Coordinates of C-alpha atoms and ligand atoms in Angstrom, one line a residue:
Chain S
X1 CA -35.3 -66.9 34.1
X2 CA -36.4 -69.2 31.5
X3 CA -32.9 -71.0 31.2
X4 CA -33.3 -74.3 32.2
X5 CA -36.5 -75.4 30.4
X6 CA -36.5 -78.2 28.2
X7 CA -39.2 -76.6 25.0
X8 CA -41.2 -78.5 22.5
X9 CA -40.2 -77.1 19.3
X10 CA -41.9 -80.0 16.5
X11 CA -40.7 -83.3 17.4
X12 CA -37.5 -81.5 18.9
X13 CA -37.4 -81.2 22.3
X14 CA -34.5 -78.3 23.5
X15 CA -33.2 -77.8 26.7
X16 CA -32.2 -73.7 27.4
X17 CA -28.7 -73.5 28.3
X18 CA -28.1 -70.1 27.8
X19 CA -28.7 -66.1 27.4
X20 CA -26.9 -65.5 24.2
X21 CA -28.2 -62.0 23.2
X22 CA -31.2 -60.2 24.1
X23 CA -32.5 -56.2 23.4
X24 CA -36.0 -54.7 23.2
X25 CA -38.0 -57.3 21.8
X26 CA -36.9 -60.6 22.1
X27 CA -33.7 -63.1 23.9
X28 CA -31.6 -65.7 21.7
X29 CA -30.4 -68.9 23.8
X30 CA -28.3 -71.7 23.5
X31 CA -30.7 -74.7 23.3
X32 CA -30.0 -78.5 23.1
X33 CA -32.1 -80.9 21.9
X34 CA -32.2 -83.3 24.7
X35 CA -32.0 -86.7 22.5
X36 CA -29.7 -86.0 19.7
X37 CA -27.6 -83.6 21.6
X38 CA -27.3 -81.2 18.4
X39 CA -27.4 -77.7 19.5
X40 CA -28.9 -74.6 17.9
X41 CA -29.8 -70.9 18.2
X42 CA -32.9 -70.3 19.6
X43 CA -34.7 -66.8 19.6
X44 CA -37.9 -65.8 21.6
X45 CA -40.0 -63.3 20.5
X46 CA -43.0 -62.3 22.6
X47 CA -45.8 -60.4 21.2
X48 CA -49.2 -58.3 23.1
X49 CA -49.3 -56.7 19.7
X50 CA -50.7 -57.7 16.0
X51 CA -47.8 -54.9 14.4
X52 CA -44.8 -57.2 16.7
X53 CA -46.9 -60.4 15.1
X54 CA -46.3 -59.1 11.6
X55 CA -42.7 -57.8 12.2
X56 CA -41.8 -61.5 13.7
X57 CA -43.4 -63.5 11.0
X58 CA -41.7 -61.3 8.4
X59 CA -38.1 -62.1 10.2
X60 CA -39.5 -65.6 10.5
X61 CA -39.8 -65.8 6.6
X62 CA -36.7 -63.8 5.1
X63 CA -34.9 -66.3 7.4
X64 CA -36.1 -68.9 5.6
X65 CA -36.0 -67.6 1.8
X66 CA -32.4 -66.7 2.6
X67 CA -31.3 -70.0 4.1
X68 CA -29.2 -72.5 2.2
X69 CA -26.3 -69.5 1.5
X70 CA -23.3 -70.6 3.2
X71 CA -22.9 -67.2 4.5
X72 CA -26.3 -66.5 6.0
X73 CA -27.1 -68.4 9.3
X74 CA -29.5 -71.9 8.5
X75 CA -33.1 -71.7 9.6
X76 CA -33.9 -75.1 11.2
X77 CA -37.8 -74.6 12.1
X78 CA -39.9 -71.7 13.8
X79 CA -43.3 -72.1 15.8
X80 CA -45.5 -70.3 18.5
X81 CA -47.8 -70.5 21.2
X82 CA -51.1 -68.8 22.2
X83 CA -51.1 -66.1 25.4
X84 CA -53.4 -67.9 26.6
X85 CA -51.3 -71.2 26.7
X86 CA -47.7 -69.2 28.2
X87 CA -46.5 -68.2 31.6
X88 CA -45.6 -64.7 30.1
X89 CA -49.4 -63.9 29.2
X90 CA -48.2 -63.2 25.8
X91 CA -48.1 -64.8 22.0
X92 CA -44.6 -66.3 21.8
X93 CA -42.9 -67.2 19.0
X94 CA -39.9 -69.4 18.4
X95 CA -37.3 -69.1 15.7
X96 CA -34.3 -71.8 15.8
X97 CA -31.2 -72.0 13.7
X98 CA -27.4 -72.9 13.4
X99 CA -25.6 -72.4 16.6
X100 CA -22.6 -69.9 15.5
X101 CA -19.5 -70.2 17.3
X102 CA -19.8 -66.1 18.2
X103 CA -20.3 -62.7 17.2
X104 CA -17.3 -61.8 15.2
X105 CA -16.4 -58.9 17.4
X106 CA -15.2 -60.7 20.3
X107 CA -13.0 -62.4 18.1
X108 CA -12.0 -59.2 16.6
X109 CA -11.6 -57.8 20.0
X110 CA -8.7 -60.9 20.6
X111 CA -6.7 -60.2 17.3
X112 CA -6.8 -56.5 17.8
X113 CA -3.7 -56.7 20.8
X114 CA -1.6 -58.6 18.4
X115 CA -2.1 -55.9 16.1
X116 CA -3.4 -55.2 12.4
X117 CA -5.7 -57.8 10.4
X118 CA -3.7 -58.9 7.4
X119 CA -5.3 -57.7 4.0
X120 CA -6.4 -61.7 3.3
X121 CA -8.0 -61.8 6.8
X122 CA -9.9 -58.6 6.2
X123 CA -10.7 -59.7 2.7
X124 CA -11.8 -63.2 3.8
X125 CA -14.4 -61.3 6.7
X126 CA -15.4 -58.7 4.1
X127 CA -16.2 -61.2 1.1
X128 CA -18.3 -63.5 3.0
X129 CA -20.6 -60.7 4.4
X130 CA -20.6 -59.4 1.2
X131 CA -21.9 -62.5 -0.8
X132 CA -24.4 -62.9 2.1
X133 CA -26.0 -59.4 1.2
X134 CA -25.4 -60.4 -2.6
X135 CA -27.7 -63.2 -2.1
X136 CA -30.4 -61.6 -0.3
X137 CA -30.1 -58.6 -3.4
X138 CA -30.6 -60.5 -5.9
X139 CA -33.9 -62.0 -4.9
X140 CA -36.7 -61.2 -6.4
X141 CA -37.8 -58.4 -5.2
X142 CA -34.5 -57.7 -3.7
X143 CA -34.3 -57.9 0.2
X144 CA -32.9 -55.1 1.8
X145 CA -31.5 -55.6 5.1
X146 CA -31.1 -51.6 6.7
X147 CA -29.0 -52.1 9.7
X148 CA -25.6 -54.6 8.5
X149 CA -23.2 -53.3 11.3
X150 CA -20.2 -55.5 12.3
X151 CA -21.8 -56.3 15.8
X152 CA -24.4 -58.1 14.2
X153 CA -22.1 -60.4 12.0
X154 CA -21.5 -64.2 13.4
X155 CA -18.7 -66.5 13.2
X156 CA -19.5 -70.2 12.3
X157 CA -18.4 -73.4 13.7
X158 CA -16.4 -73.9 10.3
X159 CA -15.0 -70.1 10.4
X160 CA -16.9 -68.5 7.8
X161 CA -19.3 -65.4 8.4
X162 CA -22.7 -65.8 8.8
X163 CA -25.0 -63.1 8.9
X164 CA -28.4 -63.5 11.3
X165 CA -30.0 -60.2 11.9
X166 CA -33.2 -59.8 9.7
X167 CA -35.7 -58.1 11.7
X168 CA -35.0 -54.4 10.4
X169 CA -35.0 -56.2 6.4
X170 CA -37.6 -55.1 4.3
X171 CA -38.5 -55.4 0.2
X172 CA -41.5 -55.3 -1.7
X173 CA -45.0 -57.4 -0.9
X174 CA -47.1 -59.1 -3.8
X175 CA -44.6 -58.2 -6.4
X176 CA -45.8 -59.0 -10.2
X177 CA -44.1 -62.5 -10.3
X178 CA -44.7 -53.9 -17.2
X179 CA -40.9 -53.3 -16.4
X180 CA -38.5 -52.2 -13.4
X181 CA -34.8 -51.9 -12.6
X182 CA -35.1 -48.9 -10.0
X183 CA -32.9 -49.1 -6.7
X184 CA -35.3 -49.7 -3.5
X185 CA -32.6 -49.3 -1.0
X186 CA -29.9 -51.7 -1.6
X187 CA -27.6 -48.9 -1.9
X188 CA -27.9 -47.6 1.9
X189 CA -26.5 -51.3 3.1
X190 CA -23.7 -50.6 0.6
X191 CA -22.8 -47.7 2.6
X192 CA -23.6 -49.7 5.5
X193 CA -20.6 -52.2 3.9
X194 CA -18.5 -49.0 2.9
X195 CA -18.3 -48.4 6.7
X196 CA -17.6 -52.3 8.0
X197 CA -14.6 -52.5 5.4
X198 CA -12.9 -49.1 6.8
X199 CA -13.4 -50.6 10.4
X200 CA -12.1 -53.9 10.1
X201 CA -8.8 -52.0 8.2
X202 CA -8.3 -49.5 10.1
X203 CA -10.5 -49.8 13.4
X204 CA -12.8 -47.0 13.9
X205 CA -15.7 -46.2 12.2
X206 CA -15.3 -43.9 9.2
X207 CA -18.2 -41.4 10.8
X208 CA -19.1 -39.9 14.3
X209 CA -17.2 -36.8 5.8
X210 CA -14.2 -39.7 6.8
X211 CA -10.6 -40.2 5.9
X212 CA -8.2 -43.2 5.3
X213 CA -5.2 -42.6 6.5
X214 CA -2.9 -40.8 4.2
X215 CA 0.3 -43.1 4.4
X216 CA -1.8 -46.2 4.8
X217 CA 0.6 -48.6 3.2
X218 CA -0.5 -51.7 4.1
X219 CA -4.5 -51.8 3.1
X220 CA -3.9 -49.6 0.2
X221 CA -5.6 -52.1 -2.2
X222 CA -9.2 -51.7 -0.4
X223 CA -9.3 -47.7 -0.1
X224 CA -10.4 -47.6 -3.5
X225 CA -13.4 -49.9 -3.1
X226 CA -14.3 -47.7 0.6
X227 CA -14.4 -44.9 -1.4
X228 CA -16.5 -46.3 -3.7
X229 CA -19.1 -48.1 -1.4
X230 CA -18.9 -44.6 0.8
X231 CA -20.3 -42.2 -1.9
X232 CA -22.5 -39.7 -0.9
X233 CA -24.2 -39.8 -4.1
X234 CA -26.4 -43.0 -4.3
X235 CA -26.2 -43.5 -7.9
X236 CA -22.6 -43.0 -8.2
X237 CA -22.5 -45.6 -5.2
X238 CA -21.3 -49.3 -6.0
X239 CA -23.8 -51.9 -6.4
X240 CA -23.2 -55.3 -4.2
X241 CA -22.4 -56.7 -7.8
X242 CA -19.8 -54.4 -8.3
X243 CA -18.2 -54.7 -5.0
X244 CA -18.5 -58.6 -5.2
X245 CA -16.6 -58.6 -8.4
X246 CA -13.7 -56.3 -7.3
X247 CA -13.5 -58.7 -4.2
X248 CA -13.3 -61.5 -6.6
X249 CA -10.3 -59.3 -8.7
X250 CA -8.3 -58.8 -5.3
X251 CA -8.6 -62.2 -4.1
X252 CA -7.6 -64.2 -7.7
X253 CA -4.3 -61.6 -7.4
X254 CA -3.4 -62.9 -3.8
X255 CA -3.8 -66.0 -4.8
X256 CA -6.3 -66.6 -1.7
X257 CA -10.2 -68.5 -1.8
X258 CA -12.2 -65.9 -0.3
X259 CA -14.9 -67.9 0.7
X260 CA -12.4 -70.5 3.1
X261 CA -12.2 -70.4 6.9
X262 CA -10.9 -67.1 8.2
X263 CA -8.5 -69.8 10.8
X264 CA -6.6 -66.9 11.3
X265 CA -9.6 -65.3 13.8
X266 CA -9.2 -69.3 14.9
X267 CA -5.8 -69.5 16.7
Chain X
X1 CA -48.3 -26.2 -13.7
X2 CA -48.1 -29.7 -14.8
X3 CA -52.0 -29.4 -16.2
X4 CA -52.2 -29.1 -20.5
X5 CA -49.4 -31.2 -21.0
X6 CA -50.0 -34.2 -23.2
X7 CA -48.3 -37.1 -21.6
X8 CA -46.7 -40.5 -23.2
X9 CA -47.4 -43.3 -21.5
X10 CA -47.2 -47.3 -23.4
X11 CA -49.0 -46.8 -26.6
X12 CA -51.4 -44.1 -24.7
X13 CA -51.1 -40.3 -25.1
X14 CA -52.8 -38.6 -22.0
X15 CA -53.9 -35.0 -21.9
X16 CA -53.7 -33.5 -18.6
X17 CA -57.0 -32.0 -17.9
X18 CA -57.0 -30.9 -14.0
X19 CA -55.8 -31.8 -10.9
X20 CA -57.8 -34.1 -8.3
X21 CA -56.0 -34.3 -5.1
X22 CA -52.6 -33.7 -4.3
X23 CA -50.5 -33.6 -0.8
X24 CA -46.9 -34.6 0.0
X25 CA -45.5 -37.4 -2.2
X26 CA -47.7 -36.1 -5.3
X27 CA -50.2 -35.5 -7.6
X28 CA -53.4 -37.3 -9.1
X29 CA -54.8 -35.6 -12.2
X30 CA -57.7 -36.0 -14.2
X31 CA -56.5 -37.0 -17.9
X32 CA -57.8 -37.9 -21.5
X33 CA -56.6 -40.8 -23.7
X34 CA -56.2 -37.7 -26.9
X35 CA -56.9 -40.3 -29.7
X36 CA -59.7 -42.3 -27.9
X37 CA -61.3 -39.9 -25.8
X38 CA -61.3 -42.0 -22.5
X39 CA -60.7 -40.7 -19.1
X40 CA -58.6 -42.1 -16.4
X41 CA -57.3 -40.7 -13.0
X42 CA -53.6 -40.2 -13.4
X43 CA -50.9 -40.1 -10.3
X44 CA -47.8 -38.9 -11.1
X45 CA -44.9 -39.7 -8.1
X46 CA -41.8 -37.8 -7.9
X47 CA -38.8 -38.9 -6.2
X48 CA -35.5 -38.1 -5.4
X49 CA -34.5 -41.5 -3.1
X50 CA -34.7 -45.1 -3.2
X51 CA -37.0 -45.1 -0.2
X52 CA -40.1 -43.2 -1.6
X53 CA -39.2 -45.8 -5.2
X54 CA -39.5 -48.2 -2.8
X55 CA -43.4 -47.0 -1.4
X56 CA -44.2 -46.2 -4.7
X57 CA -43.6 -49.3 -6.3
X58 CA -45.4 -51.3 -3.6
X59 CA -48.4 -48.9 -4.0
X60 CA -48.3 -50.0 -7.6
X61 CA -47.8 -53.4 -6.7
X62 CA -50.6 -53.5 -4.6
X63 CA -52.5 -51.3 -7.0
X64 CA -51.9 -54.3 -9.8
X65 CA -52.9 -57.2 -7.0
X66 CA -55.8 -56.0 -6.0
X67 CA -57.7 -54.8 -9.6
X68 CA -60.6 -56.5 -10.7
X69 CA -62.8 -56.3 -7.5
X70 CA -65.7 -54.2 -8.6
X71 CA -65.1 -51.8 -4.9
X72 CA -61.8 -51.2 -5.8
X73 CA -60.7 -48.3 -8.8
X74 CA -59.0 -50.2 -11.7
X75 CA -55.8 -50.5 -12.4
X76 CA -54.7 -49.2 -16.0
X77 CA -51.2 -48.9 -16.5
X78 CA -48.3 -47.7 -14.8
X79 CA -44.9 -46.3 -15.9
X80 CA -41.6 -44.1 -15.3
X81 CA -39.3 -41.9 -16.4
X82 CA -35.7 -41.1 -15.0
X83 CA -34.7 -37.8 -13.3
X84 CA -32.0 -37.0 -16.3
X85 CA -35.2 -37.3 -18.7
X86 CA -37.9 -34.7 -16.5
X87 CA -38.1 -31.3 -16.3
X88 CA -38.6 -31.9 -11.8
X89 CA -35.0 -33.1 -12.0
X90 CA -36.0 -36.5 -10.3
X91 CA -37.7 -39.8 -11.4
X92 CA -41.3 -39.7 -12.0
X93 CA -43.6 -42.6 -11.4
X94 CA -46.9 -42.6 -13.2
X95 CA -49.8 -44.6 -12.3
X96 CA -52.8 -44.7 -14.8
X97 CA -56.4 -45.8 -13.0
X98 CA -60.1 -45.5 -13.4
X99 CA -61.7 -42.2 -13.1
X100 CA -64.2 -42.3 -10.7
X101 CA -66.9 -39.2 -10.1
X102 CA -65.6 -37.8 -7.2
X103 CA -64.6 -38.5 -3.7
X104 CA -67.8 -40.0 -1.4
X105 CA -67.3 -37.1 1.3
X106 CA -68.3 -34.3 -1.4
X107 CA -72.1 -36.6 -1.9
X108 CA -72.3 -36.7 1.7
X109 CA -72.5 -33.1 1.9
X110 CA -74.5 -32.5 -0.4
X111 CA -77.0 -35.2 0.9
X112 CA -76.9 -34.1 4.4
X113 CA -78.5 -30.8 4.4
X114 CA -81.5 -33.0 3.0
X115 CA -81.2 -34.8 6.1
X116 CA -79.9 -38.6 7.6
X117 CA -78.8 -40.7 5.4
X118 CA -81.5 -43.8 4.7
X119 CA -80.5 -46.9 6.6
X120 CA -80.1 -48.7 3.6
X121 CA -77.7 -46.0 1.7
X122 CA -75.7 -46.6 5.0
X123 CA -75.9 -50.0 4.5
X124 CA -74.9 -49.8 0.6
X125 CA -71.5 -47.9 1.3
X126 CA -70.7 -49.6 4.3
X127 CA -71.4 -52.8 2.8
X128 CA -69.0 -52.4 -0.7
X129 CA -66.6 -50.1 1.0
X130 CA -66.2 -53.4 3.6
X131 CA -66.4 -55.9 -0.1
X132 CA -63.3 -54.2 -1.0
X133 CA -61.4 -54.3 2.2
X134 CA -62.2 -57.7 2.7
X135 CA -60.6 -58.6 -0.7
X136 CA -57.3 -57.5 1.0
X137 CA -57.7 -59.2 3.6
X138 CA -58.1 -62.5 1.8
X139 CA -55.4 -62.0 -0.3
X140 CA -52.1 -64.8 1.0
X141 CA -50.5 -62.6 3.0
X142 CA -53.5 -60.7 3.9
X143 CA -53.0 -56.8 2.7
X144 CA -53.7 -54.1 5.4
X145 CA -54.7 -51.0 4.6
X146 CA -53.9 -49.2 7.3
X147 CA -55.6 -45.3 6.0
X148 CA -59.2 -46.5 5.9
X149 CA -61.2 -43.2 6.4
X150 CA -63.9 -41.8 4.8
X151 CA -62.3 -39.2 2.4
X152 CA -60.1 -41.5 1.0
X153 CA -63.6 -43.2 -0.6
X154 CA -64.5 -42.6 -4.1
X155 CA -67.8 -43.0 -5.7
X156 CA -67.6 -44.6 -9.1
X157 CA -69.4 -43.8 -12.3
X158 CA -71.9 -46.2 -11.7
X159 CA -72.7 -45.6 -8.1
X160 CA -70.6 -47.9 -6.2
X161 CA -67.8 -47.1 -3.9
X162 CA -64.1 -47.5 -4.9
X163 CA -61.1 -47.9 -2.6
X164 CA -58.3 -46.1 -3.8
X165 CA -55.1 -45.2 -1.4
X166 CA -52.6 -48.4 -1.3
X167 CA -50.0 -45.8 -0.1
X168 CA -50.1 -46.6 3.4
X169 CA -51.3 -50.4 3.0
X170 CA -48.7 -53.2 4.5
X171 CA -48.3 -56.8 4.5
X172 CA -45.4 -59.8 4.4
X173 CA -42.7 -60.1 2.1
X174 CA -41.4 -63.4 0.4
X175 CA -44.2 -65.3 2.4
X176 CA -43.8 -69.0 1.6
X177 CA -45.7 -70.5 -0.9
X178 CA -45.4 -74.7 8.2
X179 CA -48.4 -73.1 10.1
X180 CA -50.0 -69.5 10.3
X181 CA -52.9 -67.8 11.4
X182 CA -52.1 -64.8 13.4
X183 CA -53.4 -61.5 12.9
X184 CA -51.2 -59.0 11.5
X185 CA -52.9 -55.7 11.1
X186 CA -56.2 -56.8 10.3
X187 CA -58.2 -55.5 13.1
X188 CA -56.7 -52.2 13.2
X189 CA -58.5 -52.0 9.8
X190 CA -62.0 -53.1 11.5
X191 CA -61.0 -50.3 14.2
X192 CA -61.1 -48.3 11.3
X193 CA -64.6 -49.1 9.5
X194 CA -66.3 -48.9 12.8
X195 CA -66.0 -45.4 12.8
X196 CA -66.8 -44.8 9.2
X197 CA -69.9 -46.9 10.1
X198 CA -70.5 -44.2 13.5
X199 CA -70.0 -41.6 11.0
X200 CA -72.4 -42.6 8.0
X201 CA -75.3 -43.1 10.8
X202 CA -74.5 -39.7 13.2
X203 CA -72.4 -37.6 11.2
X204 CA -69.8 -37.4 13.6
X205 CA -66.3 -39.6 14.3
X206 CA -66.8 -41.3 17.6
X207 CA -63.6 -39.9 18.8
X208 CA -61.9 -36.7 19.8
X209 CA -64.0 -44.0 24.6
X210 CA -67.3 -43.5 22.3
X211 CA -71.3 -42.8 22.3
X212 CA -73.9 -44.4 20.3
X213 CA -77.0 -41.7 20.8
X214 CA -78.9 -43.5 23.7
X215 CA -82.6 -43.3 21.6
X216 CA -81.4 -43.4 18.1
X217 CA -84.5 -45.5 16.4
X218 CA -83.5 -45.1 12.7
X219 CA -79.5 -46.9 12.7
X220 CA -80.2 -49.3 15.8
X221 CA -80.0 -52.2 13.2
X222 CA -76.2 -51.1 13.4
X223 CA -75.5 -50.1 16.8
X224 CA -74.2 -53.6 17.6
X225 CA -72.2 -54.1 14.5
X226 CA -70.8 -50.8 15.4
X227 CA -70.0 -51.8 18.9
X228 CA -68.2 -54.9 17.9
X229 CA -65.7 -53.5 15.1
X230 CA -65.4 -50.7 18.1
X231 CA -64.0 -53.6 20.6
X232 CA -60.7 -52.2 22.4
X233 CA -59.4 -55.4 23.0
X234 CA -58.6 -56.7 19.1
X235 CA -59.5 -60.4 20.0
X236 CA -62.7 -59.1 20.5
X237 CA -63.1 -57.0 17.8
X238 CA -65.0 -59.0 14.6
X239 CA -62.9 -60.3 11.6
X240 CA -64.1 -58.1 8.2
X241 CA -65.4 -61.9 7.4
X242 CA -67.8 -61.3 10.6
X243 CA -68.7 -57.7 9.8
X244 CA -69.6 -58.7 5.9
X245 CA -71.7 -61.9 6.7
X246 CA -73.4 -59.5 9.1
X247 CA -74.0 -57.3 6.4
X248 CA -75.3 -59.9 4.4
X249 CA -78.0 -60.7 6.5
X250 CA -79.0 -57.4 7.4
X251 CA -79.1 -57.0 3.5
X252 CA -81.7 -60.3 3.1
X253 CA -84.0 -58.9 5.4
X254 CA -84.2 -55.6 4.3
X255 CA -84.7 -56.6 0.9
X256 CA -81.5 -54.6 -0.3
X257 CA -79.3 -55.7 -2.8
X258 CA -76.1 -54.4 -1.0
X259 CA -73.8 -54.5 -3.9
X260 CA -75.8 -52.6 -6.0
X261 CA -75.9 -48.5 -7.3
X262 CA -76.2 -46.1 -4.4
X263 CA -78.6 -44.2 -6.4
X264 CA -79.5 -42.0 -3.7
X265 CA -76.2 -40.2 -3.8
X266 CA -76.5 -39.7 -7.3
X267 CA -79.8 -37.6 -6.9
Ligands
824_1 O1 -29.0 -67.5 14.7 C1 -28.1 -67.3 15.6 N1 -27.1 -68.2 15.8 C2 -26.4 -67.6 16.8 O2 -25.4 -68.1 17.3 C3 -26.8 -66.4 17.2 C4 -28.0 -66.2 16.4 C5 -28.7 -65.1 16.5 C6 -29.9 -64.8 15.9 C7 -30.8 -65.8 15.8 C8 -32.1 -65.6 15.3 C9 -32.4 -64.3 14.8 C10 -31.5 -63.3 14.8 C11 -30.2 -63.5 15.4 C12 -28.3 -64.1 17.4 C13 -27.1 -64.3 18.1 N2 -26.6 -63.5 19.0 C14 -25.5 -64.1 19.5 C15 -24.6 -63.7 20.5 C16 -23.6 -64.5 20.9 C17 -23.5 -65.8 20.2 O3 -22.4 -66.6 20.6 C18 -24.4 -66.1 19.2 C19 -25.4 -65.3 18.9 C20 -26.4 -65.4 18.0
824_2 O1 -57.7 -43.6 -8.9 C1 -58.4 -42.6 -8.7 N1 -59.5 -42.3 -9.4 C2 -59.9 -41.1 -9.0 O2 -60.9 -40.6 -9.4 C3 -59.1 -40.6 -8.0 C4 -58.1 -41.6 -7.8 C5 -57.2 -41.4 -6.9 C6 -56.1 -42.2 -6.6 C7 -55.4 -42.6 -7.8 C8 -54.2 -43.4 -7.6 C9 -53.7 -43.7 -6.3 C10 -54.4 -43.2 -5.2 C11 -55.5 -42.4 -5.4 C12 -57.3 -40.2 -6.1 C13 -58.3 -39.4 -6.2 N2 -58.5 -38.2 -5.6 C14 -59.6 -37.7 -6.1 C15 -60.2 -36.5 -5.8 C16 -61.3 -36.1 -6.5 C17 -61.8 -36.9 -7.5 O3 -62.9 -36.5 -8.2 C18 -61.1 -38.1 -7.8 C19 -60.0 -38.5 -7.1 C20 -59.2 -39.5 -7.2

């Protein structure tokens, strides 16, 4: 019940169109900005709690030191208001960004019926998640974002992924800006990857030990790279450096630009 | 079995003399510089995961960040070595500090068969071990401790107390460097002090709802501080910038130079 307000967000003012997703603690909408008529994600987060405060304001600021990747959803502007000053009783915050065109499952969900994803269109999906991940490894500290799942992966308006989903993300505070090179977690979203590239081949998840299928003619070009990214062994486990690279080997040898619209989850 | 090992460490070569405290993720030992003869506290970390590098390079981190206040210990050096190269099998973390004389909960014993602690040796320990907490909280993002308790203080060679544990300590990553003044954590840490101020005065911890002796005539300069860092609502409860100015004053009248030795524990 609070679609249908029109919110002062800055000099924006946003009129809530919609319930796009929603969970424990917060709701994304569909909001337009009533004058210019550009539209926008826009996520609510309310807060009783100092420990939510800190978690939202973290989210609120790897969104924007990751924004500006064409792969990574654009942070537009973020603000709050006091409990004392909303009709929930509660600190509220207010995080807006691109407007995707959807979660890349239910597009996923319409391909599926007629059939297999071809290997470009899995490669396409894959290499755009994966430079989004690249990006947010390489900073510095590296951000690691725990819970990449394919639910949580967005389509843009342009048909390229975009990845959104940076409240579980974590790295190091007040980093030295002596010596270090040591892996802080990166390699568990690897795994995380191994896991997305097996589903969007073969359509299951690879766990609840896995198996490719052992005739599997037709993505036989990625099964080394899942193998790879699904070691059990976290050292012997591909970096995102190494996996971007092979990604950049397959695609040069099919002739296709990995990082172009996916039109094919367009039709 | 780690003790009479002499240990490499930059251009330093540490003899392991004893060991200090210990507990799950490791060890601190007492160890001397062999060519120069000076002493330092020396952690050593083991790990087998990229999660515990993760907590132990932020301890460091924070270790680093924070040196140079005269209530917390000094940070030395810090350094590693890969699980192929240690006889644990896993990658060690080092982390060289000032030695201080011993933990502050070993003085209080001794001083409290001799009966209550003077008001103003309460005053002096509460007063620096508050200095020191306050200097995380000023840092951009604040730093929250999040373990304050009273065995975790250390009493330095001069006297003074010295915040130690960064282990469980938090804060925001890649905070830009727009509006923001939320509390984050903060006040759980005032939660914290106001029972190590209870404690100091009545040698108890005010819980397992709390009770300030009704006649008590020797601490009631600090039953009110005690009641405000004690607030259940965390709006209410006092700032560590309202709890030290507090101090301050209480300081000026008594004639007490707050920051200085706590001689009385040295005795
Ligand atoms: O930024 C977003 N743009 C979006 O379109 C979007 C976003 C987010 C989102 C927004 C802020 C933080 C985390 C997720 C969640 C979202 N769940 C969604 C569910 C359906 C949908 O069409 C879009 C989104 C969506
Ligand atoms: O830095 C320290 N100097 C110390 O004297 C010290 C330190 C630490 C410590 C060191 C590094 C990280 C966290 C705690 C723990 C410690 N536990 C201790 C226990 C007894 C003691 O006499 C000293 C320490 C001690």
């Amino acid at each position: 019940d609070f679609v249908g307000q029109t919110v002062e967000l800055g000099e924006l003012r946003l009129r809530v169109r919609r319930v796009l997703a929603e969970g424990g603690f917060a709701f994304v909408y569909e909001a337009q900005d009533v004058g210019s008529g550009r539209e926008y994600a826009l996520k609510r987060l309310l807060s009783n709690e100092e420990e939510k405060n800190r978690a939202i304001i973290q989210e609120v600021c790897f969104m924007k030191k990751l924004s500006g990747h064409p792969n990574i959803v654009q942070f537009c502007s973020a603000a709050s208001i006091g409990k004392e000053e909303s009709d929930t009783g509660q600190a509220e915050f207010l995080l807006l960004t691109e407007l995707c065109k959807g979660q890349l499952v239910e597009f996923l969900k319409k391909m599926e019926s007629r059939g297999p994803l071809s290997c470009d269109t899995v490669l396409k999906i894959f290499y755009q998640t994966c430079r989004a991940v690249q990006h947010m490894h390489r900073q510095k500290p590296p951000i690691i974002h725990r819970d990449l799942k394919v639910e949580n992966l967005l389509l843009s308006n342009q048909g390229t992924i975009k990845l959104c989903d940076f409240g579980s993300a974590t790295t190091i505070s007040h980093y030295p800006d002596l010596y270090s090179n040591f892996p802080i977690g990166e390699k568990q979203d690897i795994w995380a990857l191994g896991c997305i590239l097996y589903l969007l081949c073969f359509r299951q998840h690879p766990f609840e030990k896995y198996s490719i299928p052992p005739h599997d003619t037709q993505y036989t070009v990625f099964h080394s790279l899942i193998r790879a990214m699904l070691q059990v062994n976290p050292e012997e486990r591909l970096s995102i450096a190494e996996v971007v690279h092979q990604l950049q080997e397959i695609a040069a040898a099919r002739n296709v630009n990995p990082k172009s619209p996916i039109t094919e989850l367009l039709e």
